[PDB]
């Protein structure tokens, strides 16, 4: 039933006694459900040491992974170039999901096409679809470039993207000079970040490979910036803002900030900003090239060093105090531009905030997960603040990456109790937060389920989640945040301190019970 004056949605609607009884009948009479005592029994069992040991001995089963598939990364890279149309060679299903997955995180339209290869292409290859597909997409959406990648179906039957694309220019389905760079993005290899890697490299070669004799290291006097898989619009902005503040000329290779944040005024803009073709062709003439997220820009590294002859610096992602220092000092050394007074003041305001908040951050235990660079950067930062990383997890990580993180933990007295895990999923993580309880979790929306699980065990076992990473579906506009540089370090520090504080407030709100510690001033 409903009172028009105060209407109720599913929550709390279905809590009305009439729904409760109707559901008690459904269950008791037809679901043949296990006794509630058995359910609690098994639940209690899934929070123990014995279950953890068993849980970690999995070899075939993955439960609640923390990574997407390669082509997802490709699309995001492609989307960062001027008027280009991410094109994916393979099943339509994948694209439906890629766009839907970005729409939810960015809450914006995502351009991306498929050449819908069906059952027939499963035996005669997908040559034809590539032909018609390139033609109709070039006509319908009138792009200036089409970056091609592949779904896992195309990778299994093994279609040659190079030939297919040439046979298309051959029979004249699309102009000859029309840019059609490609990359094989095997979904059963690596993860979405590798995808961005293969896609970016595939685009760099197409515009640079055959024309390297006219290039000179230093010609345009700029510095190439390669972002990597970035889902925080504030990061593209913050880095451009600091380089521009030092007077350093630059070329951000792949900049989706514009299409992923188009204004709302009645007009739908399919294309917006991005890296122009010219900037790409002229990329070799740069002083050097910096890779914001090295751990997943390796293939790109090899090509930038063995073809453009750039002494790519060994820099960690510019997150936190120290790594932003290094990134800044190395950019000053490569362009000759000194660090302006403003950036020195900004560094000081971050240090100011760190000292204003250190008494609440010190000794707080955190569990975290996400992508390789993001995770280590966040680990470095948590350590600078005196916090205790405890469970560091990176599903799409490797053994070299893990040693790098283990070292960073040894270089500090705050990494004693930490442990890095790779190739582990969120079900593994779920056990850890039960057996060795942290104070908070830092990760994406998928961690909300681990919080609900821990809370079911009891209020004192609940592990609150601080949303940082990708993707974030249950909160709006957090994708405009910034995690890089001093600006992003300040934003992360603020989120952490105020989370500690809100949680404290919550536990001390009970009247004449725990409120004796409900201080006005904190």
């Amino acid at each position: 039933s409903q009172q028009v004056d105060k209407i109720k949605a599913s929550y709390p609607l279905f809590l009305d006694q009439d729904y409760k009884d109707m559901l008690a009948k459904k269950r008791d009479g037809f679901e043949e459900k296990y006794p509630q005592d058995k359910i609690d029994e098994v639940f209690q069992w899934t929070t123990t040491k014995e279950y953890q040991e068993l849980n970690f001995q999995r070899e075939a089963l993955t439960v609640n992974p923390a990574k997407a598939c390669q082509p997802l990364g490709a699309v995001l890279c492609a989307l960062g170039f001027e008027k280009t149309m991410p094109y994916v060679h393979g099943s339509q299903g994948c694209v439906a999901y890629f766009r839907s997955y970005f729409n939810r995180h960015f809450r914006e339209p995502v351009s991306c096409v498929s050449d819908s290869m069906t059952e027939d292409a499963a035996v005669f290859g997908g040559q034809q679809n590539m032909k018609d597909g390139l033609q109709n997409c070039k006509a319908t959406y009138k792009p200036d470039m089409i970056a091609v990648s592949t779904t896992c179906m195309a990778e299994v039957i093994g279609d040659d993207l190079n030939a297919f694309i040439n046979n298309s220019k051959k029979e004249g389905f699309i102009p000859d000079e029309f840019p059609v760079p490609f990359a094989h993005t095997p979904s059963f290899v690596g993860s979405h970040v590798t995808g961005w890697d293969n896609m970016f490299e595939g685009i760099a070669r197409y515009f640079t490979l055959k024309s390297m004799d006219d290039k000179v290291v230093g010609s345009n006097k700029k510095i190439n910036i390669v972002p990597g898989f970035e889902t925080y619009l504030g990061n593209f902005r913050v880095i451009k803002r600091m380089l521009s503040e030092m007077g350093v000329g630059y070329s951000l290779l792949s900049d989706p900030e514009e299409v992923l944040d188009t204004p709302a005024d009645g007009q739908f803009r399919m294309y917006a900003g991005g890296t122009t073709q010219e900037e790409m062709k002229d990329a070799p003439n740069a002083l050097n090239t910096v890779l914001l997220q090295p751990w997943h820009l390796e293939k790109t590294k090899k090509f930038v060093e063995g073809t453009w002859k750039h002494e790519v610096p060994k820099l960690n992602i510019p997150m936190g105090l120290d790594w932003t220092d290094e990134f800044l000092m190395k950019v000053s050394e490569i362009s000759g531009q000194p660090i302006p007074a403003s950036l020195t003041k900004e560094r000081g305001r971050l240090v100011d905030m760190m000292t204003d908040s250190h008494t609440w951050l010190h000794g707080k235990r955190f569990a975290l997960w996400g992508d390789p660079d993001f995770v280590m950067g966040l680990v470095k930062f948590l350590l600078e603040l005196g916090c205790e990383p405890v469970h560091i997890l990176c599903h799409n990580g490797n053994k070299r990456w893990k040693k790098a993180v283990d070292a960073i933990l040894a270089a500090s007295p705050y990494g004693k109790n930490a442990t890095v895990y790779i190739g582990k999923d969120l079900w593994h993580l779920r056990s850890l937060v039960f057996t060795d309880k942290p104070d908070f979790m830092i990760g994406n929306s998928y961690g909300k389920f681990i919080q609900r699980d821990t809370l079911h065990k009891g209020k004192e076992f609940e592990v609150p989640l601080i949303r940082i990473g990708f993707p974030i579906f249950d909160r709006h506009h957090l994708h405009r945040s910034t995690t890089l540089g001093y600006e992003g370090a300040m934003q992360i520090l603020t989120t952490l301190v105020n989370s500690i504080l809100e949680r404290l407030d919550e536990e001390t709100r009970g009247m004449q019970a725990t409120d004796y510690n409900h201080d006005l001033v904190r």
Partner: protein
């Protein structure tokens, strides 16, 4: 036929999305395994809002994502020995599950693995129901084929599990709700009415579905079908092998709800038809107050649906009760079409609300899908009415043009 050509944008799903996403995924006490690479399952993980009641990770597993997460090795050597191994891990880590289904992703069909045998052999071994589904994404040109494949799997491995069992105590009022995905709670919001009317819903599957309920469906006297497009298949079959009739029903708005409630009762004696009247009487004032409150603020507004012609062949439901003008897509662009027709909101068709939003046009359809709900039943009408008003009349749509041109 649908000449949906390559190189064009469409939020059209695959056979996997239709099989794992709408037909099997909702079944709460089963563990569904995305067999193949890590992507498909992650993107679909808790994507649709098929509400259910349970203890996730212990006896219900809807919002979880179990996957075989295929590496290069598995593609080359086949994932058969892997399938057998993970099924054993599921059995020890999730003892309270009542069955496993295997949703095939694109690679499975191509590298020619045989999940059927693993199902039969492991199923016999563990005395469990393991359902292999050949819903590889490239099959067919839409989710539609997935639905058909997902239905046959239900038929061949679950539906007839108790064809030789008679310990079931039936009544003359046993009914089964098939094809309701309980989006935002639509099925619960419907099941309430049908039981206040004297009927006993023995089977409600997919949404808040139970494996057990699927097996009892054949023991009913009538089959109520919400979404025919995806469950008609299994509906026609249950009528031949069991002689159980079926009918459509729609509780979208008070008009359709009363209509369909009347029609359902008719298939039964007169006491149900009387109860059906006591039910309609009981909710009469409730929806009238709803029309009294919102009709004034929604009257004259034109909602465009994806139907042929300029107006529906009949009553859509709730839109009419609120005095809204429902238009069609003509008899055949589509982007400019809408700009020239300038509706007040798109009610359905050619998905992706974000494109329309940029064009200044609301996009909230027949089902919850994303945020509110339920939208069906009498309680659902009020919810639908409120949301319609907030979307249509929100001041954000009147700010697209800056006051300085």
């Amino acid at each position: 036929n649908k000449k949906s050509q390559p190189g064009l944008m469409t939020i059209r799903g695959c056979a996997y999305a239709g099989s794992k996403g709408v037909v099997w995924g909702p079944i709460k006490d089963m563990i569904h395994i995305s067999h193949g690479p890590v992507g498909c399952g992650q993107y679909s993980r808790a994507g649709r809002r098929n509400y259910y009641i349970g203890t996730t990770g212990v006896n219900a597993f809807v919002t979880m994502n179990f996957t075989s997460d295929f590496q290069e090795k598995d593609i080359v050597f086949g994932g058969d020995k892997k399938l057998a191994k993970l099924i054993d891990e599921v059995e020890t880590l999730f003892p309270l599950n009542k069955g496993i289904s295997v949703q095939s992703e694109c690679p499975i069909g191509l590298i020619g693995d045989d999940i059927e045998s693993v199902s039969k052999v492991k199923g016999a071994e563990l005395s469990k129901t393991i359902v292999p589904v050949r819903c590889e994404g490239f099959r067919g040109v839409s989710q539609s084929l997935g639905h058909h494949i997902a239905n046959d799997a239900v038929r061949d491995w679950v539906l007839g599990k108790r064809d030789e069992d008679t310990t079931f105590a039936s009544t003359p009022y046993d009914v089964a709700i098939i094809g309701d995905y309980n989006i935002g709670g639509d099925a619960w919001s419907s099941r309430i009415l049908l039981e206040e009317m004297g009927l006993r819903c023995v089977a409600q599957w997919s949404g808040d579905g139970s494996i057990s309920e699927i097996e009892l469906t054949p023991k009913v006297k009538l089959n109520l079908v919400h979404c025919y497009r995806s469950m008609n298949y299994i509906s026609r079959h249950m009528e031949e092998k069991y002689g159980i009739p079926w009918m459509e029903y729609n509780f979208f708005g008070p008009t359709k709800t009363i209509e369909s409630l009347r029609a359902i009762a008719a298939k039964f004696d007169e006491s149900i038809q009387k109860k059906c009247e006591e039910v309609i009487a009981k909710y009469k004032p409730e929806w009238e107050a709803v029309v009294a409150k919102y009709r004034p603020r929604l009257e004259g507004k034109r909602v465009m649906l994806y139907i042929g012609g300029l107006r529906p062949r009949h009553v859509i439901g709730a839109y009419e009760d609120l005095g809204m003008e429902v238009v069609g897509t003509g008899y055949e662009e589509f982007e400019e079409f809408v700009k020239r027709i300038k509706p007040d909101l798109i009610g359905s068709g050619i998905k992706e609300k974000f494109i329309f939003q940029k064009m200044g046009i609301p996009f909230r359809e027949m089902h919850s899908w994303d945020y509110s709900g339920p939208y069906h039943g009498f309680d659902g009408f009020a919810i639908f009415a409120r949301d319609m008003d907030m979307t249509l009349n929100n001041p954000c749509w009147k700010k697209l043009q800056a006051p300085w041109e």
